[PDB]
């Protein structure tokens, strides 16, 4: 019955999104969420919902929601879905098998690219073992790809575990930056639900 | 690991496509293949690192693909200025270049080289590579030395860098008689060879490598030729 708008404005319209390997997470609570404005925006390239169908989100009440945001390459978007495998779904950001939420993505080629090449976006490439769902790894220790221990210094068979996307305004549509926001619902006194 | 350039030589016309091929002796788990284009009389230029990602100020005609033991480069629409040579470089447990294909048709950081160009046989050779626009003791860079001769192609000599202290590496062929010395006071690095032989006649370049950019030779030097003769 409380009447205050959810801060959906700042999440989607933030000036800076973090790298895929250090994705942000935000709690939204004690507010009424109007999901109609998002859907009829036509500014989103992809709006896919698992376990819950849109156009009914204005009903239903949730315990608490989650907003995960980052930026990745345009082609790699299809890896953000349950049961998918790849570099992103193994070493960077993995979704559980029982996901109940929606995935929103839209092209951002005119904000995240620079003339000289943007090297401020990175992604993890090597890891000893795959990730568990919703687990984040931030460390930057040197990966040991061979029999000879590296002892914390890089060299032959001692690779740095992070690599740069290198976005540019002239890249193909498959290699352009895309912004992604993942909403997770959990279905306790419900606090967030629309009018 | 040995890289073999599959197409020998191609002759095309303006407008259509071109297709290259690079083959690895065994699997490259590091996946750090890079493609370089060299015009005559000029230092090589970087095109693609990571086998797919574009470099700085490069049009969209060039495309890269491949994985495992094979790789390919594709040119969408040729231009009369594409009279050049194209190489194929890898990194991992070893650093090796490729033979390369000759194709014929019908900026904020600078490296400057200095040193003598002629030396008496059985003497010492000294070269220096001054840096403008960066600090030689950077945390995320390495400084290399490359040399080229027509009989052997492009050859890797040695490298130096600094993470907590100074670290050096050298190629097995030249281990016994090579030295690399940095100097932070005047921000340079120099190469020394105590003994020289007639076959050493070659053209030398100094190059910078950034670890987050696929270990690709980003910025090259002017390069100078050295001839060993009486
Ligand atoms: C984020 O910013 C966009 C851009 O201004 C907002 O969407 C616009 O809102 C105005 C009303 O103030 C409408 O007239 C435009 O048609 C909207 N454009 C689009 C593309 O939606 C949006 O309201 C802001 N907040 C969120 C959560 O998106």
| Domain at B55, CATH number | 2.60.40.10
Atom 14 in ligand 1: residue holding the nearest Cα: A41
Q: Whose CA is nearest to atom 23 of ligand 1?
A: A9
Residue B38 to chain A, least CA–CA distance (Å) = 22
B73 and B87 housed in the same domain: yes
Does residue B42 form part of some domain? yes
Going from the N-terminus, what domains does chain A have, and what CATH number goes with each? 8-185 (3.30.70.1840)
Chain B within 8 Å of A174 (Cβ-Cβ)?
Answer: no
3-state secondary structure B66-107: EECCEEEEEECCCCCCCCEEECCEECCCCCECCCCEEEEECC
> Is B169 in contact with B158 (CB distance < 8 Å)?
yes
Q: B40 φ, ψ to 5°?
A: -60, 140
Contact (CB<8Å) B211/A154: yes
Residue B229 lies in a domain: no
Q: What is the resolution of this structure in A?
A: 3.3
Is A175 strand, coil or helix? Answer: helix
The residue from B62, B83, B105 where one domain ends is B105
Name the residue with the closest Cα to ligand 1, atom 4: A13
Tell whether B118 and B217 lie within a shared domain: yes
Q: Which secondary-structure segment (H or E) carries A72?
A: strand A65-73
Residue ranges making up the domain that contains B216: 110-221
Chain breaks in chain A (C to N over 2.5 A) after: 187
- Is B29 part of a structural domain of the chain? yes
Tokens representing residue A104 in the block: 């929103």
Residue A91's SS3 state is helix
Looking at the structure, tell me whether residues B15 and B116 fall in a common domain.
Answer: no
Residue B226 lies in a domain: no
B53 with A166: Cβ contact below 8 A: yes
Query: Judging by DSSP bridges, how do beta strands B101-105 and B9-12 pair with one another?
Result: parallel
> Is any Cβ of chain A less than 8 angstroms from the Cβ of B164?
yes
B227 lies in a domain? Answer: no
B84-97 in b/e form (b: 16+ CB < 10 A) is: bbbbbbbbbeebbb
* Within-domain flag for B126: yes
Q: Check chain B for breaks (C–N over 2.5 Å) and list the residue before each, or none.
A: 106
Q: Do residues A111 and A157 lie in contact, with contact meaning Cβ atoms separated by under 8 Å?
A: no
Shared-domain flag, residues B9 and B59: yes
Q: How many CB atoms lie within 10 A of CB B24?
A: 20
How far is A166 from A176, CA to CA, in rounded Å? Answer: 10
The residue whose CA has the least distance to atom 7 of ligand 1 is A41
Q: Tell how far the Cα of A55 is from the centroid of ligand 1, in angstroms.
A: 19
Query: Cβ(A43) to ligand 1 under 6 A?
Result: yes
- Interface check for A75 against chain B (CB to CB < 8 A): the answer is no
Q: Is B163 on the interface with A (CB under 8 A)?
A: yes
Residues of B in contact with A156 (CB under 8 A): 92-94, 169
> Exposure of A92 by Cβ count < 10 A (0-12 exposed, 13-18 middle, 19+ buried)?
buried
- B212 → closest Cβ in A155, A163, A172: A163
Rounding to the nearest 10 degrees, give the CA dihedral for residues A35, A37, A43, A44.
Answer: 10
Considering B105, B132, B153, which residue would you say is the last residue of a domain?
B105
Question: Would you say the CB of residue A9 lies under 6 angstroms from ligand 1?
Answer: yes
Question: Which of B55, B84, B105 is the last residue in one of the domains?
Answer: B105
Tell me if B46 is assigned to some domain. yes
B147 and B95 in a single domain? The answer is no
Residues 6+ apart with CB under 8 A from A167: A112, A113, A114, A117, A118, A121, A175, A176, A177
- Counting atoms of ligand 1 from 1, which one is nearest the CA of A9? 27
Does B212 contact A117 at a Cβ distance shorter than 8 Å?
Answer: no
Helix (H, G, I), strand (E, B) or coil at A8: helix
- B169 inside 8 A of chain A by CB: yes
Same domain for B134 and B64, yes or no, is no
Sign of CA dihedral B136, B170, B166, B28: positive
Contact B163 A153 (CB under 8 A): yes
User: Is residue B130 within a helix (H) or strand (E), and if so which, with residue range?
Assistant: strand B125-132
- Say yes or no: B44 and B93 in one domain: yes
- Contact residues for A50 (Cβ-Cβ < 8 A; gap 6+): A81, A82, A99, A100, A101, A102, A103
- In-domain check, residue B122: yes
Nearest alpha-carbon partner for B74 in B52, B45, B104: B52
**Gap between the Cα atoms of A11 and A26, Å rounded:** 9
Contact (CB<8Å) A156/B213:
no
d(CA A40, CA A58): 13
Name the CA dihedral angle for B85, B90, B96, B97, rounded to a multiple of 10 degrees: 0
Structure tokens at B106: 């019908």
For residue A118, what is the nearest residue in chain B, using CA coordinates?
B56
DSSP label of B51 = T
Of B192, B216, B190, the closest CA to residue B58 belongs to: B216
Method by which the coordinates were obtained: cryo-EM
CA–CA distance, B166 with B186 (Å, rounded to integer): 17
């Amino acid at each position: 019955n409380i009447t205050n708008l959810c801060p959906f404005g700042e999440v989607f319209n933030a000036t800076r999104f973090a790298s895929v390997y250090a994705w942000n997470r935000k709690r939204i609570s004690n507010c009424v969420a109007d999901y109609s404005v998002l859907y009829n925006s036509a500014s989103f390239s992809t709006f896919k919902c698992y376990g819950v169908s849109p156009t009914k989100l204005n009903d239903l009440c949730f315990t608490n929601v989650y907003a995960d945001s980052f930026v990745i390459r345009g082609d790699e978007v299809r890896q953000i879905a349950p049961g998918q495998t790849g570099k992103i779904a193994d070493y960077n950001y993995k979704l559980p098998d029982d996901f109940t939420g929606c995935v929103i993505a839209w092209n951002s080629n005119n904000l995240d690219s620079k003339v000289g090449g943007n090297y401020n976006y990175l992604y993890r490439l090597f890891r000893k073992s795959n990730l568990k769902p919703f687990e984040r790894d931030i460390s930057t220790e040197i990966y040991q790809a061979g029999s000879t221990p590296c002892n914390g210094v890089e060299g032959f068979n001692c690779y740095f575990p992070l690599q740069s996307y290198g976005f540019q305004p002239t890249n193909g549509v498959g290699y352009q930056p895309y912004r992604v926001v993942v909403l997770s619902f959990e279905l306790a006194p419900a606090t967030v639900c629309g009018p | 690991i040995v890289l073999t350039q599959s197409p020998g030589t191609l002759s095309l016309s303006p407008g259509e496509r071109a297709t290259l091929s690079c083959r690895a002796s065994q699997s490259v788990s590091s996946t750090f293949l890079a493609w370089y284009q060299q015009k005559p009389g000029q230092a090589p230029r970087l095109l693609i690192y990571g086998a797919s990602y574009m470099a700085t100020g490069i049009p969209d005609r060039f495309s890269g693909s491949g994985s495992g033991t094979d790789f390919t480069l594709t040119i969408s629409r040729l231009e009369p200025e594409d009279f050049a040579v194209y190489y194929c470089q890898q990194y991992g447990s070893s650093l090796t270049f490729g033979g390369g294909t000759k194709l014929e048709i019908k900026s904020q950081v600078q490296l400057q080289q200095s040193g003598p160009g002629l030396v008496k046989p059985s003497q010492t050779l000294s070269l220096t590579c001054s840096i403008s626009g960066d600090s030689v003791s950077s945390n995320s860079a390495a400084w290399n030395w490359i040399r080229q001769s027509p009989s052997r192609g492009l050859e890797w000599l040695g490298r130096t860098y600094y993470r907590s202290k100074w670290y050096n590496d050298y190629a097995g062929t030249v281990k016994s008689r090579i030295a690399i010395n940095p100097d932070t006071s005047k921000n340079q690095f120099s190469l020394h060879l105590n003994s020289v032989t007639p076959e050493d006649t070659a053209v030398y370049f100094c190059a910078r490598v950034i670890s987050v950019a696929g270990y690709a030779f980003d910025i090259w030097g002017q390069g100078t030729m050295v001839t060993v003769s009486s």
